[PDB]
Amino acid sequence: MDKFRVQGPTRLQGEVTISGAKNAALPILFAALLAEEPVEIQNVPKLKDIDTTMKLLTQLGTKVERNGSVWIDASNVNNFSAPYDLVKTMRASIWALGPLVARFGQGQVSLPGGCAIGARPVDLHIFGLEKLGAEIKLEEGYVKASVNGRLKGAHIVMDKVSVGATVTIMSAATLAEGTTIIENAAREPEIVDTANFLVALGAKISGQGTDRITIEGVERLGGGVYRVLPDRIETGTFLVAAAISGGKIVCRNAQPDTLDAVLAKLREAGADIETGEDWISLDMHGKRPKAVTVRTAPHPAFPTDMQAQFTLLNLVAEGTGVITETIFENRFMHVPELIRMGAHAEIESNTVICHGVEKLSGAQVMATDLRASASLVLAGCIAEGTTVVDRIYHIDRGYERIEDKLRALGANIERVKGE
Amino acid sequence: MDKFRVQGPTRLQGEVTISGAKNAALPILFAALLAEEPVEIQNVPKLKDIDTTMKLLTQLGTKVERNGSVWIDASNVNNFSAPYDLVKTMRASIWALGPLVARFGQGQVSLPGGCAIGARPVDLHIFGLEKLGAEIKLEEGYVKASVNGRLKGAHIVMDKVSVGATVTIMSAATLAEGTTIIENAAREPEIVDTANFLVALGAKISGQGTDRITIEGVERLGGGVYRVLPDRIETGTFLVAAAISGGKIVCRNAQPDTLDAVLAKLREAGADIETGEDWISLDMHGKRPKAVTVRTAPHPAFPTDMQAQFTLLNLVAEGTGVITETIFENRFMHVPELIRMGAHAEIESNTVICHGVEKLSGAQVMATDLRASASLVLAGCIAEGTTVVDRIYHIDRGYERIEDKLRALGANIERVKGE
Amino acid sequence: MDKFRVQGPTRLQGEVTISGAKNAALPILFAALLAEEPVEIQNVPKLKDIDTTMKLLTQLGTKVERNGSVWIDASNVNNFSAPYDLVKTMRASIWALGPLVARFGQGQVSLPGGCAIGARPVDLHIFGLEKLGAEIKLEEGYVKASVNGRLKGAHIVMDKVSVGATVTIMSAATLAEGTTIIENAAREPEIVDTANFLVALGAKISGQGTDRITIEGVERLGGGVYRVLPDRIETGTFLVAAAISGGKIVCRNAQPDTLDAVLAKLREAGADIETGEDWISLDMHGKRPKAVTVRTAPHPAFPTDMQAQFTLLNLVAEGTGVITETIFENRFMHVPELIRMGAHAEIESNTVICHGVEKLSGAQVMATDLRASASLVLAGCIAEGTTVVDRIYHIDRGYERIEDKLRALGANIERVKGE
Amino acid sequence: MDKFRVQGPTRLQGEVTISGAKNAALPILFAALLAEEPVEIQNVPKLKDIDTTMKLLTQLGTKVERNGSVWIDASNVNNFSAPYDLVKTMRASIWALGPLVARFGQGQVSLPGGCAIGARPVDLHIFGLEKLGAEIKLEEGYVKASVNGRLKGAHIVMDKVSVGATVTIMSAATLAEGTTIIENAAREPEIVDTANFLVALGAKISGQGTDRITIEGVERLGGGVYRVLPDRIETGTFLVAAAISGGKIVCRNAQPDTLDAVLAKLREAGADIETGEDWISLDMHGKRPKAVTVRTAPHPAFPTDMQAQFTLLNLVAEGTGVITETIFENRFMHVPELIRMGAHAEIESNTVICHGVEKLSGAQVMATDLRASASLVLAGCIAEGTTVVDRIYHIDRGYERIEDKLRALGANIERVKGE
Ligand SMILES: [NH3+]C1CCCCC1
Ligand SMILES: [NH3+]C1CCCCC1
Numbered sequence A, B, C, D: 001m002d003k004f005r006v007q008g009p010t011r012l013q014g015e016v017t018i019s020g021a022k023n024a025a026l027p028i029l030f031a032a033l034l035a036e037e038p039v040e041i042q043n044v045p046k047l048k049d050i051d052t053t054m055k056l057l058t059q060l061g062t063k064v065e066r067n068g069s070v071w072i073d074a075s076n077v078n079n080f081s082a083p084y085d086l087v088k089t090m091r092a093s094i095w096a097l098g099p100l101v102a103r104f105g106q107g108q109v110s111l112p113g114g115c116a117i118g119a120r121p122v123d124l125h126i127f128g129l130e131k132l133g134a135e136i137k138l139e140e141g142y143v144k145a146s147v148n149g150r151l152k153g154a155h156i157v158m159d160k161v162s163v164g165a166t167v168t169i170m171s172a173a174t175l176a177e178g179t180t181i182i183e184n185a186a187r188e189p190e191i192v193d194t195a196n197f198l199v200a201l202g203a204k205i206s207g208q209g210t211d212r213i214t215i216e217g218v219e220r221l222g223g224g225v226y227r228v229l230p231d232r233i234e235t236g237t238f239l240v241a242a243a244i245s246g247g248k249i250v251c252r253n254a255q256p257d258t259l260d261a262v263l264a265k266l267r268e269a270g271a272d273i274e275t276g277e278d279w280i281s282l283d284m285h286g287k288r289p290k291a292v293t294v295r296t297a298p299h300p301a302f303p304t305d306m307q308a309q310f311t312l313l314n315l316v317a318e319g320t321g322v323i324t325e326t327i328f329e330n331r332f333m334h335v336p337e338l339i340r341m342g343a344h345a346e347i348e349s350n351t352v353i354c355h356g357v358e359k360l361s362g363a364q365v366m367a368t369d370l371r372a373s374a375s376l377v378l379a380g381c382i383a384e385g386t387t388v389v390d391r392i393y394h395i396d397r398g399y400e401r402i403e404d405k406l407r408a409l410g411a412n413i414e415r416v417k418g419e
């Protein structure tokens, strides 16, 4: 069990290059199953689900090779069943279902099991595919879908906003007969990217980024070159590291319009921010952040994946700040860990009242959420002494080697394998 | 009791000139109590609360005269108590409190009474003034505020978004000593207008229209000329009248950027919309609206004051539409009335599942909410036969003589006084 | 000399606010000399002649101030001579003669000399005043009209239709004792607007717009507020600019009924025109106009002042169309310039035979007529490359900053101060 | 002849992407003739000489394709003559000589005649190849170099510092047997980049950038991917454009270390400069530069190619500053042009004494030098009015569409195709 030994305090300053978003890379890699011609998917992070995804794709008959880009040849896909040993590892594997049924008329995906029933993560994908004309077959542990001929464009009203389901329905709708209209569609930048990649291949999609997506089915999708958008959450993470350490950074390969709410909150914290078409710089000019009031909300509001990071900022800011979590219940496990690092906070329900302290003290901390865990590495950077963040695999799975990026901003961090 | 006798169906087409918003006019008229020099407030609707407001202002020693504009001379305000006989009529009279205390150090407003306690409408104004340094005195029926010297700029965190309170705090903060920062500020266009009017007089305010307003207190406010923004809800109302009748209209003196969500919903309904800097045209080209899915949300999302009007549109649209009300519980009283006019709908909780019918049938209908009541006049315009909308005073109080505007679009409507 | 440097091709689209007609504004300003009470002349363009007229009016003892309106107080006129220095710049200064004699019993206007004698410009004005009872005194350099008492109504048959003489006679007649009949009165919209202003101050005038104007003299004229009608020729110019560049335009503050013939011709050219009471929209829908046949004749037929502009529309349209000047000679001097931009046309007698070309090429062009000079700017905007229109001062004096209005529609234009 | 018509004043601000240095790209393209395997030359500007060189290379049997990179396959060179038709257009074609003889044993370059004899351009190249063992054959119209076997390393003392001869000698030496020493080698960044490309294909070169380059001949050179360094002079030009217009700019794809002297001078002028590894930001903060003293000298001192630009910065700066050319004569021919734009300067010997003026006035100007001609465009942008820079073809050949880059920074500029 790799852990991170962080020694502070260190001011974080320098340049960081942002990785492509895994949450844009994944749905686009699955959507590539619709492409008859070879595809080059650029700016793909090297992360565990990317590797599980290429292995899965390979199991279906896809020719996949990698390195900066992921090159895909899906012209000869011929195994329409995503097996449990390749899918047990990753929930995103549900995204192979839509493309297989839309293009080949059949698909099946093994499912991870449970005692809890009702509004399980895959349920909206099943019903979105069913809405589009697919015949669904379920038995515990798998979902099988098939369609007689082509899927048929449908007017789908999502009762709940789902990124997962929005991608499944949108992507399957590109080869459906006619027009599909998705109401109450997820607006996440990863949704827009997946829609643009699909358009790049020949799909007819509009409203991506808005609450209503319109898809005009076409006969087949071609191939092409497509660059995955920058990871907006990793960008925010780095921007908070320089903001909580009196730092100055430049985030390269960034996409500023995916972070309006985050940047606005940083500017309220006292940050001096400038942005380019592909970059964001932040300078605290050596000042302590000023506390902020944050309310997480669906994109494009302040993102819940930036909440633990902003908790940490209030916790070392000047003043009293409140973080209100409206998306997720229970996403405050970083709090007790930070209280152990010397923070002053009160959790009242789905909020934390933060009372900024000048300095934190190093500790043996652990969080299972990757944003909370990464916030712990960050506090460790500015805390006095040594901080040991355990169960670092949660960060490694969503951040392309954060210690190398952090070490490059002046952090004293080291990976400690075993013990 | 004036009622409206409406005979249809009539296609609604032509031009309508939008009135200034009463909800922008009211807070600006109260904010004019801060102006040492004469002020010309243009584009003020001629409505009951405008008349109660001028009478109140006059009682405080304000010189007020009217006609298109409302000219105010508040240099000699010298009676700082808003009496019950002038305020019992209007809740907005709470807005005299902030300006009187900020400018004169004392103010008192009579209050309408009740058995229900906790989060009463005036409570956030009292605590916002208290936050700014005012000493509050309460006894059932009145609120008295005074301050020793000047109010003092404060960092206020609103736990609930309040247009009312945002205006009170913002307006009082213009003469406070220092900077006031309002977190979770209401963003309504009426908030931006009131902020711009204040700026017009010499105030230092920024972030109006955003969730964080910053006010840098100044010593005194001057005078000037200011035009109240168009009424965005009356504009929406007219746009729905042409959209539900196969109509074509041009809304003059409009402000298109205050209605992005409304226009987007109309375009989803099949409307052909073009807008100018001050105008909006809509053409259904004789087609029936297509049903839409609507979710009311805080500005700038779809407004709850447009919900009854869009209920009516789904109810005569082609297809099944759902209206979800998230702002107000219980704002579906127009539904049973429309069901009586031949509509097909199901209310499930805070939603209505609408099944569009080609034509409605005239009826004796009544609604107490002015948007619901106005929606009833509109259905009456397109319904078969005669519709009698009773208790029309609810419309008259918020719409400058809608029958004249409607009659001008081809409606067969008549005011019937008594019986 | 100032020149306009234009870069095309550009599609002209957007909104344009039509300015008040200068030829309605000049006769109305001079007529204000009759007003005993202050008058506000709204919608007056800012053009050289307006400036000369305010200057001329001030010299008579009139108090005048400007900006969107021109405010006049002619209550203290004490000087009754319009001197050579002010009048040598403007032919319209003759218009001071009738109101001075009618109201004050005497007027004197300096005239520029010439060796030509015989049906000279002003002889209808001189003789029309003389038929109204004025005594006329002439010396080569000027004309003086005077009367003891009041002028007296007369039945006047004009041998030539003259807008200038119609205005002088009609304005003077408003204060004459009795009834004046003007047979063969000018029927132009600017005549009608002058009569309407006069009637607004209390005159009794009927038949304006007809071949016979009947005036019932009143003892005095008041004051008030009067808005100058929209410039119909500027309106057609902008409508032609959209029509020839595949554009879409909304002409605001327009008066559709003073342009019926132009609008009908534009619809014949393929234009999708919509009109309101104070606006006109034209949409080409990205298409090229279709050649049209035009015969210019006296108002309300197709106006000769729109001929240059429609000659340019036919030269870039689809097809062959001929333009005939039914009254005026030597009006196609801009056609050789346009042929130098790649146009195809034969000029035969009073007609220009046009053979539309798809695209023009920039050239160095010059027209001495205001309208033909404005047509050459319009041509620069659609031509390939750069057009340099020389001697632009005619356009500056007849169009209120046409470069700013064109620019707002998409034109790339520059004023070149050197030659 | 093409001219640039510029309209000022304009503040130049924004981002600009620096193009690859043409003078690094030319010597690298010719050096690719030595590569046995295909090579991708990235970051090559699209300029005339690049086009001439690809054309010249194709004639030798090289397979070349372009766009952001230049792809070369010199595996089949079968023709070893660079003919008059291709070379008469470009002096840099001499660079084909060394690689042809080194790799293929023979090369021939046509030379344009001249009646002047004696330390002619190419005599260092001819004699440098001859010291490497080549046999040189000369006839007035051309030079042919050939060798039986391999060239052989030699200790070469250059009597004159020459970038051209340094490139020919160093490139040829990479395939020679043994060690070549070049004493008094050119030290420019473009020399260093050429040596670095050579080393990238497998050469053994050290001391590039120093007064002595040591080469260890290898038997063959491979292939690969090599990116041309950023144009340092274009970088300084854009940095000067921000600095003289109160601007703010980010130079992207820059290499700060090839401009130390220019950056230090800019900081002396009042500029707020920040640098990264591939970017440079400069902010004037809306202020006017302060006059600076400049002495141009050999790299890495202040570059003579930045003199014209800094002469314009001093002429619009606050104060007096003198610019001295320490090596080159007759380099201030653009100063009379700038004095014609209202500048104050005395040209005394090899120095220009500058007295800053607050604003320039447009004029019709022309400079024959590329850099002085680019300085005159920059001057047009800040001057009042219109500047017409004639004979712009020098700038087109040395700067990759400077008008598009200027325009993106705010410049109003036009190419005028006629004279
Ligand atoms: N100002 C006028 C806009 C064109 C439509 C009607 C209003
Ligand atoms: N196309 C239109 C623009 C002007 C208002 C009415 C319709």
Ligand SMILES: [NH3+]C1CCCCC1
Binding pocket: A250, A252, A276, A279, D250, D252, D253, D276, D278, D279
């Ligand atoms: N492209 C470069 C932007 C200036 C800052 C660092 C990235």
Ligand SMILES: [NH3+]C1CCCCC1
Binding pocket: A250, A274, A281, D250, D274, D280, D281
């Ligand atoms: N002023 C800045 C722009 C370039 C990136 C870093 C700071």
